[PDB]
Design a protein around this ligand. Structure first.
Ligand SMILES: NC(=O)NC1CCCCC1
Length: 330
């Protein structure tokens, strides 16, 4: 089997991407944030505290003839950005882009934090990291990808995120028309439950490539590119008037600037992030200070190849017995 679904930016900055997901019988279509940095499929629901719902589409398990309460199971998650959600669990039929899993754990939110309530465009998350990070207790549950894997033509999914445009998530096949050149594969460590890999180095604009190992995660659920302070300082030193602002919470730059590109290494290959991809716009409406798309990871404890990096590539998440990542230009 295979599936193929279009992913759409939630706003004009590509702050996140939503992909329609069919849940239940008859189908209830919710727009989920596909997140390769977490392992829970959770939804706004008929159980969510009413004051915490503001425009999201909800899953109502009582209207699905295939929903079953997973007796005793609860979940509770806290993300890197400080947001959180918790609730109970149903099993139900879940389809993505024509690919169907029966008996998927659908985590129903009883509570969500303010950042979720305040984002009317995201109806929940669909986690695509390794199932070892799933929060369900007392019986940990499998991701949608882990449940689908055995039925797929090939045990893979691909992320093809657009810059200010729709893209695609494919399951079970590699669309050889979606990228240029060849795919370079690189080793993955699953020891922290993430798609964790080591970049071979970087370049700023037309500068010389610096060969240096940068361990980090491929995370579709993180907006920005978080890298060591040495690397980030080197990038923003090329932008007149850029500075790290403690008050704003990262590097800012004059909105009048033209930003340089940023290149990262995948083995002997190179992925170039155009400068425009690094512009996240005014810090506040009408400001001439703009927020940077490359930020320090110093305060995180891990480097994160988030959407700024991934949307410059066609990315293969290879879930073979020994997982690997693949990157191609496009
Ligand atoms: N994706 C995140 O922001 N945090 C993850 C940490 C590991 C457990 C699942 C959530």
């Amino acid at each position: 089997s295979t599936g193929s679904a279009t992913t759409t930016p939630i706003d004009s900055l590509d702050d996140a991407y939503i992909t329609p997901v069919q849940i239940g019988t008859p189908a209830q279509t919710l727009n989920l944030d596909f997140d390769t940095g977490s392992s829970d499929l959770w939804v706004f629901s008929s159980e969510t505290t009413a004051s915490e719902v503001d425009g999201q589409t909800i899953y109502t398990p009582s209207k699905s003839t295939t929903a079953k309460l997973l007796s005793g199971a609860t979940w509770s998650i806290s993300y890197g950005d400080g947001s959180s959600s918790s609730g109970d669990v149903y099993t139900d039929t879940v389809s993505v882009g024509g690919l169907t899993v029966t008996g998927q754990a659908v985590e129903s939110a009883k509570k969500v934090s303010s950042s979720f309530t305040e984002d009317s465009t995201i109806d929940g998350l669909l986690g695509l990291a390794f199932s070892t990070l799933n929060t369900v207790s007392p019986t940990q549950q499998k991701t949608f990808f882990d449940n689908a894997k055995a039925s797929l033509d090939s045990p893979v999914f691909t992320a093809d995120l657009g810059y200010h445009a729709p893209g695609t998530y494919n399951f079970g096949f590699i669309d050889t028309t979606a990228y240029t050149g060849s795919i370079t594969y690189t080793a993955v460590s699953t020891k922290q439950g993430f798609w964790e890999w080591t970049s071979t180095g970087y370049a700023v604009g037309s500068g010389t490539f610096k060969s240096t190992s940068i361990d980090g995660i491929a995370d579709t659920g993180t907006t920005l590119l978080y890298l060591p302070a040495t690397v980030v300082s080197a990038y923003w030193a090329q932008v007149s008037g850029a500075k790290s602002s403690s008050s704003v919470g990262g590097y800012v730059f004059p909105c009048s600037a033209t930003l340089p590109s940023f290149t990262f290494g995948v083995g002997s290959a190179r992925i170039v992030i155009p400068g425009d991809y690094i512009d996240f716009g005014p810090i506040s409406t009408g400001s001439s200070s703009c927020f940077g798309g490359i930020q320090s990871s110093a305060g995180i404890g891990i480097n994160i190849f988030g959407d700024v990096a991934l949307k410059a590539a066609f990315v293969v998440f290879n879930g073979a017995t020994t997982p690997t990542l693949g990157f191609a230009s496009k």
